[PDB]
Structures are given as C-alpha cells and as structure tokens.
Design a protein around this ligand. Structure first.
Ligand SMILES: C=C1[C@@H]2CC[C@H]3[C@]4(C)C[C@H](O[C@@H]5O[C@H](CO)[C@@H](OS(=O)(=O)O)[C@H](OS(=O)(=O)O)[C@H]5OC(=O)CC(C)C)CC(C(=O)O)(C(=O)O)[C@H]4CC[C@]3(C2)[C@H]1O
Length: 277
C-alpha cells in the first residue's frame, strides 16, 4: 500500500509546487513567445517586461487567468512518475558505467540515460506540455482556445498528430545539454551552489527551449519553420540573438519561487508525515 500513497502524495507535493509558481511561469511563456503572438494577431503590442506583462494580463483577463493551463502541469505528474518508477533505474543501468572506472564514460552514460529516458517519457507526455504552452500563450483581447480538450481537438483537426509534437527534437537535445551542463558545472564545484548550477544550466540551454516553444506556437498557423535549425537561424536573423533569451529572468524567478514553496511544503510535510513524499 506504501507505493500508492507515496505516489498520490508525491503527486500532491509536485502539484502544489508547480501551482504556486504558475503565474510567473505563464508570464515566462508569454514573454518568451510574444512575437509569434504578434504574427498571429493574438497580441496587440510587445511586452516591455515582467511587470508590464503582469499588469496587462491582470487587467485584461484577471487574477485566476495566471493559472491558465496549470491543469496540464498537475496531470503531467502521474504518467511521468509511472514511466520513471518503471524504466528509469533500468535505463540507468543500461547506459551506465561505474564512476570509478572513468569520467568520460560515466558522463556519456548520464547523457545517454537522461536523453533516452526523457525522450521515452516525452513520447507520451509532450502533448501536455504542448497544451500547457498553447493555453498559456493565447490571450484574451476572444480567446484562441476554449480549453485543454479544445487545444487537442483543434490542433489535431488543423495539423494532426504532428501539431501536438512541435519542437520534439530540440526538446530532447535541450534535455541532454541541460543535463550535461548541470552535472558538469555541479561536479566542477565541489547548498546554495546548486541553485547557481541550475540557473546556469537553464540559462545556457534556454535558446533550445525558446525554439521549442515558438515551434509549438507555429502549430495551427499557415506559416511554420522548416525545422529547429531553420527556426533558430530565422529568429537570430530577424530579431537578434538576445531574442532567444526572452523569459529567462522570469524563469529564474520561477526557480526561486518554486524553491521557496517546495522548501516550505517540505517542512510542513516533515511536521505531518515522518518523511517527505
Ligand atoms: C530545452 C529545454 C530546456 C532544458 C531542458 C528542459 C527541462 C529543464 C528538462 C528537465 O529534465 C529533468 O532533468 C533533471 C535533472 O537532470 C532530471 O532529474 S534526475 O533524473 O534525477 O537527474 C529529470 O529526470 S527524471 O527522470 O528524474 O524526471 C528530468 O525530468 C525528466 O526527464 C522528465 C521528462 C518528462 C522531461 C525537465 C524540465 C524541468 O524544468 O525540470 C521539465 O520538464 O519541467 C524541463 C523544462 C523544459 C526544458 C528547458 C526544455 O524545454
């Protein structure tokens, strides 16, 4: 019975952790993909910053709208953990070398394991991230999407199954790069430095995330990029390199907020239950 309750309570912890940081997350998504919104006509004028995004979004839509799409983040836990509880340890020993043998082999092992497991999860999961991004992106001025199922329906009707999986490759590569830089920077520096490593890894692997999400944005529209590389080149050529880093600061804010609320809830969990879930 221990596993069922552990699964449910882990679900609760993750749900609260993500829900608490949901507004700044949606702000991140809005600032990141604003140009696509401008092309689609969803947005009127570009966001001046985080504060401006907060003010405009709150004024036009309201307070609860800051949690738009969060349901996907809440549901996403269950299939993710189910696949990880079943395959992650198996995949780790599949590509894994002992750290005592060598570092060049072990590191590659981590890259392969993380990449394969991440891709395997995204094979079932990516739809929810897509729906999350799209639901966070469409803003009332008449909303583009009515809900989650509406996103699924209309995306399938317009683009098919391909539309649900926009930016899969740069997401996998993004996971690999983020992982490698995380473990590299962390092992090079050897509990505050962990947040520094996370911030660095997220910031350095951020352009791939931007490309991914904007590729998600191109879904359903008449015009789309000819791949992740074409997307990257077009973005850099049209808006500049810095445009690849839109929403990165808000992402960091999301990181510190998430850290805060997960710490607090972990303490409450400590008081109530013997151990954290
Ligand atoms: C291109 C990018 C940027 C860089 C890579 C990813 C993540 C950071 C990649 C990150 O990827 C996580 O990286 C962690 C640190 O190595 C790793 O932890 S560890 O194994 O214990 O070491 C997690 O593996 S897991 O098996 O425990 O669960 C892994 O999550 C997944 O593999 C779940 C997949 C469904 C993604 C997950 C995630 C996160 O912010 O945490 C998430 O899905 O929320 C991504 C956000 C989106 C981007 C941002 C993707 O757009």
């Amino acid at each position: 019975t221990n596993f069922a309750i552990n699964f449910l309570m882990g679900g609760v912890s993750a749900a609260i952790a993500k829900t608490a940081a949901s507004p700044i997350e949606r702000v991140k998504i809005l600032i990141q993909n604003q140009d696509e919104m401008i092309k689609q006509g969803t947005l009127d004028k570009k966001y001046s910053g985080i504060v401006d995004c907060f003010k405009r979004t709150a004024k036009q839509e309201g307070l609860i709208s800051f949690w738009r799409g969060n349901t996907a983040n809440v549901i996403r836990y269950f299939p993710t953990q189910a696949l990880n509880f079943a395959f992650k340890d198996k995949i780790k020993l599949m590509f894994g070398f002992k750290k005592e043998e060598g570092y060049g082999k072990w590191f590659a092992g981590n890259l392969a394991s993380g990449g394969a497991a991440g891709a395997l999860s995204l094979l079932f999961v990516y739809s929810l991230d897509f729906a999350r991004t799209r639901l966070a992106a469409d803003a009332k001025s008449a909303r583009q999407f009515n809900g989650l199922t509406d996103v699924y329906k209309k995306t399938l009707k317009s683009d098919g199954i391909a539309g649900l999986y926009r930016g899969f490759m740069p997401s996998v590569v993004g996971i690999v790069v983020y992982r490698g830089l995380y473990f590299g920077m962390f092992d090079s520096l050897k509990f505050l430095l962990g947040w520094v490593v996370t911030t660095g890894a997220s910031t350095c692997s951020y352009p791939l995330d931007t490309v991914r999400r904007r590729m998600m944005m191109t879904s359903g529209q008449a015009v789309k990029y000819n791949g992740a590389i074409d997307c990257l080149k077009k973005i850099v050529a049209s808006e500049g390199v810095g445009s690849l880093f839109k929403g990165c600061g808000a992402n960091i804010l999301r990181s510190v907020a998430g850290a805060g609320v997960i710490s607090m809830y972990d303490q409450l969990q400590m008081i109530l239950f013997g151990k954290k879930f």
